[PDB]
Amino acid sequence: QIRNMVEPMDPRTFVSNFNNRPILSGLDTVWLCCEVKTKDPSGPPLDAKIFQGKVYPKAKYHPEMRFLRWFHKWRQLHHDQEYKVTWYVSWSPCTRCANSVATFLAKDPKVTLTIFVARLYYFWDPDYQQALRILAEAGATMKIMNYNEFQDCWNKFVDGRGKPFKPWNNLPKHYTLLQATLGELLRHLMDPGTFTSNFNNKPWVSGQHETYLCYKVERLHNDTWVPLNQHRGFLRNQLCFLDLIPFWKLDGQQYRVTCFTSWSPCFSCAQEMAKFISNNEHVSLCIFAARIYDDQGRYQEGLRTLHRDGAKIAMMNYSEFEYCWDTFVDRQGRPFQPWDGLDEHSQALSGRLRAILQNQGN
C-alpha cells in the first residue's frame, strides 16, 4: 500500500538519481524514500513519504531534516509506540545531517532507523567518514542499496506502471565497491602517525590545529564498573560528543564515560559537557587531556565549571597513552612507543591543571 501512501516519483528521475556509479559529479539532488512501521515486522507500513532536496549549502532543507520535522509532527498524531523507519536515499547524509539524525537517535529510545544509500557522498573525505561512524554509533543501521533494495524502491515509490525493475549494467560491481568502502570506513581506527602527532604532550611546535577525542563507556553492575566494548569511539574536531552516545541502549543503570582528548576542552565544549552532565544524573564524566589548551580567553572558567558540575579532569600519563594506543589506533600489532620525558611533561602539565582547578588556598 506504500504506492497509495505516497506521490510516487517518475521512472526517469529514479534511474537518474539512484544510479550507483560511485562517482557522479552533477547530481546535486537528493531523494529520500521513507517508510514507517511498528516494531513487529509482520505488520504493514503505517505511512510512507518521499522527500527531495539539494545537496549544497543550507542543510536545514536537506531531505533528512525535512524527514525529522515531518516525523516529529507525525508522531504527535498517533498513539505513542515504537517505530522502525527505513530510508532509501540516493546520497548518504552530509556531516550536519549526520549529527542531527545521530543525536535524535541517541536521545529517542522508541525509534529504529535503517538507512540504505545508493551512493556514498564524499566517501574520500575524512569528515564524511566520521559522519558515517557517528550515525552508526548512535544506532542507525547503515547499508549500501543492493539490487534487491533498488527493486523494492522501484516497486514501492516509483510509478513503474506494472513494469518490473530492470537493473543497469555494473549495478553489482558498483555495489561491491561501495560496500567495501562503507565497511572499511566504518571499521577505521586512528592512524599511528595521527596518534603520535596529536597526543604528544611536548609543547606545541607545529600543526595540531585540530582536537582528537577518544572515549569509552562503562556501566555499573553490583558496584563494579563493567566496560561496554561495543560503544567506544574517536572523533576529530576543529555539539558535544556525549549527545551522540545512545545511553538508552546500554544495559541500564549508571554510566561512566571516560574521555581522552589531545587538547583540553575549549570553553564552549566544557560548557556543553557541563550542561550534559548536569541534565543527566545517571552519567559520570572522566576527562583526560594530553595538553592544556590556552585559548587566551575563558578556558580556565570552563574547566572549573566542568569540575564543579561533577566531572573528573586530569592529564594523560603513560597509562592513558598506552591504553589509547592499544584501543583506538590501527597499531598493527606494534606496541606503544613512549617518547622521552613523557612522564615529566605529564607531571608538569598536571601541576598546571591542579593550579587551574584549585579553589581554596592553603
Specify binding-site residues for Zn(2+): 62, 64, 94, 97, 266, 269
* Min separation Cβ 169 and Zn ion, Å: 24
Q: Is 170 in the site for a second copy (CB under 8 A)?
A: yes
Site string for Zn ion, 76-95 (x = CB under 5 A): ------------------x-
For the annotated binding site, the residues are: 62, 64, 94, 97, 266, 269
Binding segment (CB under 8 A) for a second copy, from list 134-142, 175-183, 262-270, 275-283: 175-183
Q: Is 345 in the site for Zn ion (CB under 5 A)?
A: no
- State whether the Cα torsion 169-172-175-181 is positive or negative: negative
Applying CB under 8 A, which of residues 1, 147, 148, 180 lies at the interface with a second copy?
180
* Min separation Cβ 232 and a second copy, Å: 17
- CB nearer to a second copy: give 24 or 292: 24
- Integer angstrom CA distances of residue 274 from 50, 228, 237, 344: 39, 23, 18, 30
- State whether the Cα torsion 56-168-140-127 is positive or negative: negative
Query: For the chain, what is the total number of helices (H) and then of strands (E)?
Result: 12, 11
- Integer angstrom CA distances of residue 86 from 83, 105, 217, 268, 335: 10, 13, 28, 35, 43
Q: Is 185 in the site for a second copy (CB under 8 A)?
A: yes
Residue ranges with strand state E in 209-333: 211-220, 225-227, 233-237, 255-263, 283-291, 312-315
Residue 172 contact among Zn ion, a second copy, none, beta carbon within 5 to 8 Å by kind? a second copy
- Three-state secondary structure call for residue 236: strand
Q: Is 177 in the site for a second copy (CB under 8 A)?
A: yes
- CB nearer to a second copy: give 145 or 353: 145
- CB nearer to Zn ion: give 25 or 359: 25
Applying CB under 8 A, which of residues 172, 297, 310, 341 lies at the interface with a second copy?
172
Site string for a second copy, 20-39 (x = CB under 8 A): --xx----------------
Residue 292's closest CA among 193, 203, 178?
203
* Min separation Cβ 95 and Zn ion, Å: 8
Do residues 58 and 13 make contact, with C-beta atoms less than 8 angstroms apart?
Answer: no
CA distance 237 to 351: 27
Q: Is 102 in the site for Zn ion (CB under 5 A)?
A: no
Q: Is 147 in the site for a second copy (CB under 8 A)?
A: no
* Min separation Cβ 330 and a second copy, Å: 11
302-305 own/partner pairs: CB under 8 Å, 24+ apart: 302/265, 302/266, 302/267, 302/268, 302/269, 302/270, 302/271, 303/264, 303/265, 303/270, 303/353, 303/356, 303/357, 304/356, 304/357, 304/359, 305/270, 305/271, 305/274
Site string for Zn ion, 46-75 (x = CB under 5 A): -------------x--x-------------
Q: Is 143 in the site for a second copy (CB under 8 A)?
A: no
Task: Give the interface with a second copy as residue ranges (CB under 8 A).
Answer: 22-23, 123-124, 170, 172-174, 176-181, 183-185
